[PDB]
Amino acid sequence: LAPSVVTGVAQSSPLTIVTNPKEPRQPVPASDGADYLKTIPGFAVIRNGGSNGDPVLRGMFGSRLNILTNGGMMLGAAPNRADAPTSYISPETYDKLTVIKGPQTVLWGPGASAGTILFEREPERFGELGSRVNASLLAGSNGRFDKVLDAAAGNRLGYLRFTGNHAQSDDYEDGAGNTVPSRWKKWNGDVAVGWTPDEDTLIELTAGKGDGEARYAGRGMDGSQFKRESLGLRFVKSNVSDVLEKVEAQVYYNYADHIMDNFRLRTPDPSMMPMPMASQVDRRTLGGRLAATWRWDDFKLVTGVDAMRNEHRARGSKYDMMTDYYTDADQFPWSKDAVFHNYGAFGELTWFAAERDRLIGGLRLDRASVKDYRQTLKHAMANPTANDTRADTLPSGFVRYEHDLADSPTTLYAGLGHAERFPDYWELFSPKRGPNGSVNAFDKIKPEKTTQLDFGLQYNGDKLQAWASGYVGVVQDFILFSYREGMGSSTQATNVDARIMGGELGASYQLTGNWKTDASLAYAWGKNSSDDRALPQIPPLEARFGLTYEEGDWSAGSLWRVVAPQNRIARDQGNVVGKDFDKSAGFGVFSLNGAYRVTRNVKLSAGVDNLFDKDYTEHLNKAGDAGFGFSANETVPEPGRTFWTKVDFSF
């Protein structure tokens, strides 16, 4: 029971990773969804500024990742993806994080081409009147503090629970002594009312809001509001019969209301946005899920349907140059531009054939649709697709086979999976051109259809615990973005065919009773088959080595992160956020941490991130901004040396 600081999370079982987001983590996260993925091999993070990075899994970006909060979806609204889904998610407020790698599940919605990421909160169940609380307080270099509170009280016929957080940090500095434009502020508060009329039933009401700020060194505008409101309803009846083992039903409402501007966290420079300017955009998502679990004999079957509708609006500021009067964005009416629908049916079937063999297969069928509400485009021109609808029905599915060896505690696995994903908001509305000879992006961007083989192994010995996961795949009609400066600067979305391949592996050895040593490796590769080029924004080879000493009451450990250069890039190509420009330099970062359990109710941890004050940037981080004094194409640098300490109470 020696307490530790997390520097990496293992594959505890084929393709799936499970972690507790309320334990301290070595390179210390913002209150950010993406930063809590940095400990899971396979993930990289596009740096935008201080917080709210854009997470990338085995080279893949964006909606190729299903990131659900409590089974529900939270979608932001900036055409920038300045408020990416994970900018609204504060992971210390949830109880469990779970990553399913590859297109190997169909329970959690459509388009899960790269992987599935589930943040969830667990129901409370008192057996009598009682009340537990969990809190944490953290403080660190450059004015970072994070405060989180999880309090609940109840009895056997119900409970009520409050979960909140407050977190911020000033601008950090790099390994060369410069202030990076990067400060941020975040808070959330969500309440849950839970009714438990017997030992099998649970109805839960949930409501919560949150807001935040964030200065972005990588952008021309900052996030001055990340307002979120959400509602939810859960139903869990258990053991309805000998065969129906669970029936779960849920509905969710998430509303995002974002503001980008160039005057509240910065000042307009000379550069093609010299005037004070702001843009307010919002996204209203409503959806539900309904699933029955059948368990009998050697079979488990999960059957269900789900649905989702979401709607996007925008409205912008207006600044008069003769009078220098600024009219804020909220003085103008809302302009709807997009509405999306998805309805889907799914099943997934597991066969427990003997104890050393399992075979899992799953299928789902989705009907996805979108309607363009833009009467005009922006000087305003008439929108050639104003009020057009497109739809499509996309089947997806997978089979996976897991076999355990007879002599050693080893599990081998191989799975083959197919994902079909209707296009994004950002892939359909944000690009200023479609494929060549096309009206718009909206009418010609084809859905992305990826087909991939997953394989790997698990091994759990007494002194050794190791895992490996490799993949090779093709992506048909990959949605790629191309950048050119010309009038001004503009993107074009196209559909290409892509080969991709890579993997991750990790191992932990227990040397002494007190010494542990772990390591992990992550490799991602991509090729644009249609132009005999490499795929853009692909993170380079990355290993992490770690040694820690435990002693019952406390623990100390060190960590080395080592990343190769990246030499395969596709210049002026990427996603809606970033573009490849230059090859990248390798680098190494070494860090220290420690943890001490003061008593059963209080724990202590601390660490030094980047001990040797390395000045370095990651291949995926955004470029500079010129307005912030950034050069030719300097990508935003990582933090330099940083100190932090955190106390955890639990009664």
Author numbering: 14 to 283, 285 to 392, 398 to 505, 507 to 671
Excerpt from the publication:
Here, we show that Pseudomonas aeruginosa OprC is an outer membrane, TonB-dependent transporter that is conserved in many Proteobacteria and which mediates acquisition of both reduced and oxidised ionic copper via an unprecedented CxxxM-HxM metal binding site. As indicated by the successful structure solution, OprC contains a single bound copper and shows the typical fold of a TBDT, with a large 22-stranded β-barrel occluded by an N-terminal approximately 15 kDa plug domain that, like in other TBDTs, completely occludes the lumen of the barrel. The CxxxM-HxM configuration, which coordinates the copper in a tetrahedral manner, is highly unusual and has, to our knowledge, not been observed before in copper homeostasis proteins.
To obtain copper-free OprC after purification from rich media, we constructed a variant (OprCAA) in which the binding site residues Cys143 and Met147 were both mutated to alanines. Even after equilibration of OprCAA for 30 min with 3 or 10 equivalents Cu(II), no coelution with metal is observed, indicating that high-affinity copper binding is completely abolished and confirming that the His7 tag does not bind Cu(II) with an affinity high enough to survive SEC, possibly due to the presence of 0.5 mM EDTA in the SEC buffer. The binding site residues of both structures occupy very similar positions, indicating that the introduced mutations abolish copper binding without generating gross changes in the binding site. The largest change is observed for loop L11, which undergoes an inward-directed motion of approximately 8.0 Å upon copper binding (S3D, S3E). Some loop tips (e.g., L4, L5, L6) in OprCAA lack electron density for a limited number of residues, suggesting increased mobility. In the double mutant, copper becomes solvent accessible due to the absence of the Met147 side chain (S3D, S3E).
